[PDB]
Design a protein around this ligand. Structure first.
Ligand SMILES: *[C@@H]1O[C@H](CO)[C@@H](O)[C@H](O)[C@H]1NC(C)=O
Ligand SMILES: *[C@@H]1O[C@H](CO)[C@@H](O)[C@H](O)[C@H]1NC(C)=O
Ligand SMILES: *[C@@H]1O[C@H](CO)[C@@H](O)[C@H](O)[C@H]1NC(C)=O
Lengths: 374, 365
């Protein structure tokens, strides 16, 4: 078994804090000092990529693959996801990612980020929403959208659904709200990127009269980076979701070390709160470390060109993929386990409610117990 | 400008007749550039064989790919075309979301369905659906039910695997006094439902079935029609169109060994769209030649990229009259300015009850 295990890191725009977390988590692994916990050294090579440019993506990918990385940690968005996941699959290279989990059932992709679909439906059922607005963009896939629409027609809900991902003129957000008023809409499910939730909540405020008696369910694990203070001061109900428990001892010990870090070597550590994707980035290193300690323990002998059409041995990379998907470890995002398609399984999503009465953790959700209120 | 234009053909399960229509439409065009193609068959049950199919076609160096997707292979196939700038031309269901580099031969059906629910003043009905043609119709029904305060009882039936279970759903709907059905399912599944409607008895007279599927001519609705039920269907092929008759006349005369499904089954509308795709392709490449764009190979992961923009634009710019009527596309590759014919079959008889287009909406005769 090699002394050093090298991995790739594919980063994009606006993954600066995650890149620092990736660097800090790898460092933490390397320091120590425990023979059993650190039986090899973890190296990496990092490329930045412009997802808007396909050659930029395949280029970054081939660079890594052709250095002989044992795995690639990385990000994708809607433009690059298919290229990136399809090539990892064709080349049998394990891709570990905090990005939105793929709609398709795919191989060689370890998805650090848990599905939100189950938790949202359980909560809609809990609140008994049978009439509501659903504002959505498509940056995290079509899985929530399709489940909502099917639930709506099957359950006789009245869902007014509006796509808002292509909106650039913030005025348009205003008009849509006014249009929702004509249907006496008080309840909004917002399935959008954080940045876009922020823009919508700013318009609700600028517009006025859309806080008291309103309820906004924010379908995004990035709950902590959402700016909702002004909406909350107006009387609104807000529901959100998180997978990082600030009371968790592991989250705590990570945070204490993390906020001391220098802003030049680790940008975004001191000037912004820890994004949940930075926690998922940390936990990815735990998963990788654990997978590879396992392979080492089994005396596995870990074994081309960046080309699709020419072949690829069937059993290649299978050993690593399995080792990654069989891990059960406790991280900053709780219990971490994967199913055969690399999806988080047996995970917990914490549910938060903000009301004029105050702000609190209102329960938790898991696949077996569904929503448990507290 | 090359004399020979090469295209790929990506064929699936249950596209035999379309494959024969493809080969024949190309032959007709060839018998001034010449059309070559290479076929790959595809299994969509893996996100893997899909990537493999597209990559093989891509490495041959084709100028466009004619082919099919299903709900499973759709995102991966169309995404590859968009990323590698290779135009995909297809009779498959039009994509729910706006995509680039996908020319969709098949027009949206939702406008026509809504226009007709209004014409009939349906306010309470059953909505049976599978998701094999996307969510576009389902979403438009959801929206319209809210907008007009409809009382829609909706059941998903795509996953039903025992035909007996369809009788059970129909009975439940009887307890709700349902007489009006909107069926948004594959043709095969529609045939199964109508067979269960018949077997059940007493569900013809008094009932009205609106069949949301452009494969109207493949629906077996004779027994149901003899019982007194109302049926409404939709088509995009006019069998009285000279061009359709001329194609058919030569097509039924092909030997069954080389052209399977021409003699033992009526032309599917998807086979007509397949013929129309060759029309669109031939016209697009006449444009590019006229523009003096030169179109004269590597691996998926390695200029024919730079030309893709122009090919895609030529395709989407064409206007041609085909077996499916006027053919034009918008910036997202969706049919535009198309006509849908509406057929109703009553106890009084069967007839084209009018046509629907985006501007006039439904125009009864
Ligand atoms: C907001 O929460 C309150 C407190 O439970 C609830 O009773 C009310 O119905 C909610 N508002 C809306 C619009 O649902
Ligand atoms: C899920 O995780 C819990 C807590 O980590 C663990 O004890 C249990 O083994 C897991 N359950 C299943 C069903 O895998
Ligand atoms: C069927 O057809 C006639 C129109 O000729 C119509 O009035 C009747 O209401 C329709 N039947 C049903 C069940 O809706």
């Amino acid at each position: 078994f090699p002394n050093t295990i090298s991995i790739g890191g594919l980063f994009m725009r606006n993954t600066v804090q995650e890149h620092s977390a990736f660097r800090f988590a790898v460092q933490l692994y390397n320091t120590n000092q425990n023979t059993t916990e650190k039986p090899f050294h973890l190296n990496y090579h990092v490329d930045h990529l412009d997802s808007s440019n396909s050659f930029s993506v395949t280029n970054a990918f081939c660079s890594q693959f052709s250095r002989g990385v044992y795995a690639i940690f990385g990000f994708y968005d809607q433009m690059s996801m298919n290229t990136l996941t399809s090539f990892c699959g064709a080349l049998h290279t394990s891709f570990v990612t905090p990005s939105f989990p793929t709609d398709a059932d795919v191989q060689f992709v370890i998805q650090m980020r848990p599905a939100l679909k189950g938790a949202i439906l359980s909560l809609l059922s809990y609140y008994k929403w049978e009439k509501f607005v659903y504002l959505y963009d498509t940056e995290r896939g079509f899985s929530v959208l399709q489940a909502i629409m099917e639930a709506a027609v099957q359950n006789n809900w009245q869902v007014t659904a509006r796509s808002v991902g292509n909106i650039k003129d913030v005025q348009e957000f205003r008009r849509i709200i006014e249009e929702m008023d004509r249907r006496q809409e008080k309840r909004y499910l917002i399935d959008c990127e954080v940045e876009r939730i922020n823009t919508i909540l700013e318009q609700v405020v600028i517009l006025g009269k859309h806080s008291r008696g309103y309820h906004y369910m924010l379908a995004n694990l990035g709950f902590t980076d959402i700016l909702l203070e002004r909406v909350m001061h107006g009387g609104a109900n807000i529901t959100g979701f998180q997978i990082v428990n600030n009371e968790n001892p592991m989250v705590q010990q990570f945070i204490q070390r993390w906020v001391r870090l220098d802003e030049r070597e680790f940008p975004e550590a001191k000037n912004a709160p820890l994004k949940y994707t930075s926690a998922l980035t940390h936990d990815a290193i735990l998963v990788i470390a654990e997978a590879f300690r396992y392979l080492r323990r089994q005396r596995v002998d870990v074994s081309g060109d960046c080309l699709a059409n020419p072949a690829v041995p069937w059993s290649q990379g299978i050993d690593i993929e399995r080792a990654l998907k069989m891990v059960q470890v406790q991280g900053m995002t709780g219990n971490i386990q994967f199913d055969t398609y690399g999806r988080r399984t047996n995970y917990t999503i914490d549910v938060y409610e903000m009301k004029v009465s105050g702000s609190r953790k209102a329960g938790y959700w898991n696949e077996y117990e569904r929503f448990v209120p507290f």
